[PDB]
Amino acid sequence: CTVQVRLELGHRAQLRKKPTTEGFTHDWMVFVRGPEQCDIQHFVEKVVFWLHDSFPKPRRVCKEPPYKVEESGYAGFIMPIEVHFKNKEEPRKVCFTYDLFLNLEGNPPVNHLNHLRCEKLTFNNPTTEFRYKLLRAGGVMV
Numbered sequence: 001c002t003v004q005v006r007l008e009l010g011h012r013a014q015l016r017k018k019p020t021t022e023g024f025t026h027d028w029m030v031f032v033r034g035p036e037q038c039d040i041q042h043f044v045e046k047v048v049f050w051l052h053d054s055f056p057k058p059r060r061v062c063k064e065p066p067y068k069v070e071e072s073g074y075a076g077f078i079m080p081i082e083v084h085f086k087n088k089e090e091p092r093k094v095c096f097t098y099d100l101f102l103n104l105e106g107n108p109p110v111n112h113l114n115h116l117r118c119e120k121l122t123f124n125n126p127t128t129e130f131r132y133k134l135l136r137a138g139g140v141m142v
């Protein structure tokens, strides 16, 4: 059989009225979460957010929900996001290339923004133990 589950990747960003002592101009948050009333913790081991090299501890890990990183900084960047599964067979993780953008190139000028990216994952022939976790999370058998 085939089991599909859904992830939502997203972020929010806020232009600061005044920059931090550090000069940070934006506050931002990036997340991985399930659709409403779906508990992805059943099948997600951890979520690794790979921040820009300039960040201290750029490898940010959440082993439990919420799977998110709140930060402040100077600029947007491309953020690899690994979602590791509670799975003993391949694949044990999926990697997303997440566009963490902090403005719209002043066209138009915004002082905040939100983005959501809905992702479907398809697991062929999961083990009994991993099927239970996927379906327990609200996954659909196909």
Ligand SMILES: Cc1ccc(C(=O)Nc2ccc3nc(CN4CCCCC4)[nH]c3c2)cc1I
Pocket (backbone or CB within 6 Å): 052, 054, 055, 056, 071, 072, 073, 074, 075, 076, 077
């Ligand atoms: C292309 C590019 C993109 C982002 C940054 C950036 O925001 N870097 C940055 C560098 C150091 C930072 N430190 C923080 C603050 N956190 C607070 C929580 C504890 C660790 C430090 N945010 C930081 C943000 C720099 C470049 I060049």
